[PDB]
């Protein structure tokens, strides 16, 4: 009839309550959003005297575990005193509350996907675009320190918090899906729509593969639409190969679900699968000069004559994401060299 004394629901999850008061401390607002580990609430430190995000774990051990390795990432992160350290959301403190783990973060605006749904997923400016990218790359530079070696692992808009409504400053959130750099554990992994080929071809995988998400979030910012959306793994990669083009032979050659996606002819070479519904343009025949928007006035032509959306400034928005997008995850551009690349002066 009841759950945990009856403060929990069926689903494990902690029954929220505005006005509830924790520990002498906290002052339970109102709810933020939901997941699968449980819980965000809003609550006010009177302590600190700030607002502050509260991450309620579900009362039930495998979740608890699950938050615990975030809990260690998330410290790990806060020993490295850098001013890189500050585009990662602050993990403040834990606690136990009646048999569920809290995790107190700052607390942030809303998400990328909420500033995205804002411009009727028409995107943001170039310029704010450039903004964004540039801390994002600072904060994947952060992550390959060596003691950390830290994949987020599940880089998505939603994932991506704004700090100051009034600010352009943003930092990652839900390091829950993160491990650090071992031996393959975990096949299945990140966001579909930002799943490095790697990932789909049941390839090794490192730190890269964040790098590929940044690069489909970049796009995705700028014309307000996900470049990969696909309804599944062979929707997802055809659509990438719409764009970039059938993968390298010497990629395919050693891809274990290689015959997942495409076909080896006798001659040694490597084409697309015919699939079922849906159809396609050729391989690499959807240019990402096209989907941008470089020489037609950005994407819908909504930015022409905007000061910042010059062919010049296209191309070189375009020559980053392509490096990003790189095929191969050992030559695929890297956080330190990102930063370095003409977009950002
Ligand atoms: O969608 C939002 C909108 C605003 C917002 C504000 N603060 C947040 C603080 C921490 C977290 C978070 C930490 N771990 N996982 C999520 C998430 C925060 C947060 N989120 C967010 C982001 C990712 C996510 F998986 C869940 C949320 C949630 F809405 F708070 F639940």
Same mark, same amino acid.
């Given at each position: 009839k009841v759950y945990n004394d009856g403060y929990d629901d069926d689903n494990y999850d902690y029954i929220v309550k505005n006005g509830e008061k924790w520990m002498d401390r906290y002052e339970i607002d109102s709810l933020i959003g939901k997941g699968s580990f449980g819980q965000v609430v809003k609550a006010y430190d009177r302590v600190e005297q700030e607002w502050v995000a509260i991450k309620i774990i579900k009362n039930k051990k495998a979740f608890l575990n699950q938050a615990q390795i975030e809990v260690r990432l998330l410290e790990l992160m806060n020993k490295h005193d850098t001013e890189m350290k500050y585009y990662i959301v602050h993990l403040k403190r834990?606690?136990?509350?009646?048999?569920?783990? /809290?995790?107190?973060?700052?607390?942030?605006?809303?998400?990328?996907?909420?500033?995205?749904?804002?411009?009727?997923?028409? =995107?943001?400016?170039?310029?704010?675009?450039?903004?964004?990218?540039?801390?994002? /790359?600072?904060?994947?530079?952060?992550?390959?320190?060596?003691?950390?070696?830290?994949?987020? /692992?599940?880089?998505k808009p939603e994932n991506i918090l704004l700090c100051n409504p009034k600010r352009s400053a943003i930092k990652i %959130?839900?390091? =829950?899906?993160?491990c650090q750099l071992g031996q393959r554990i975990y096949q299945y992994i990140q966001s579909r729509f930002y799943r490095s080929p790697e990932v789909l071809l049941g390839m090794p995988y490192d730190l890269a593969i964040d790098m590929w998400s940044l690069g489909c979030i970049?796009?995705?910012m700028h014309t307000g639409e996900p470049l990969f959306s696909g309804?599944?793994? %062979?929707?997802?990669?055809?659509?990438?190969?719409? %764009?970039? !083009?059938?993968?390298?032979?010497?990629?395919?050659?050693?891809?274990?679900?290689?015959?997942?996606?495409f076909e080896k002819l006798p001659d040694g070479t490597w084409n697309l699968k015919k699939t079922k519904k849906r159809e396609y343009k050729?391989? =690499?025949?959807?240019?990402?000069?096209?989907?941008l928007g470089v020489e037609? !006035? !950005?994407? =819908? !032509?909504?930015?022409?004559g905007e000061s910042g959306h010059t062919v010049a400034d296209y191309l070189k928005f375009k020559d980053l994401i392509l490096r990003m997008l790189d095929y191969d995850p050992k030559t695929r551009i890297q956080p330190y060299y990102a930063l370095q690349h003409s977009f950002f002066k």
């Open positions: 834990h606690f136990m509350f009646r048999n569920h783990l /809290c995790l107190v973060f700052e607390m942030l605006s809303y998400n990328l996907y909420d500033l995205l749904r804002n411009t009727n997923f028409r =995107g943001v400016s170039l310029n704010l675009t450039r903004k964004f990218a540039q801390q994002m /790359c600072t904060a994947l530079l952060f992550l390959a320190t060596p003691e950390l070696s830290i994949i987020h /692992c599940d880089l %959130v839900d390091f =829950g899906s993160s970049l796009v995705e309804a599944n793994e %062979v929707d997802q990669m055809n659509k990438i190969v719409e %764009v970039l !083009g059938i993968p390298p032979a010497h990629i395919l050659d050693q891809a274990p679900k290689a015959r997942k996606f050729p391989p =690499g025949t959807r240019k990402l000069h096209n989907i037609t !006035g !950005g994407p =819908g !032509g909504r930015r022409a």
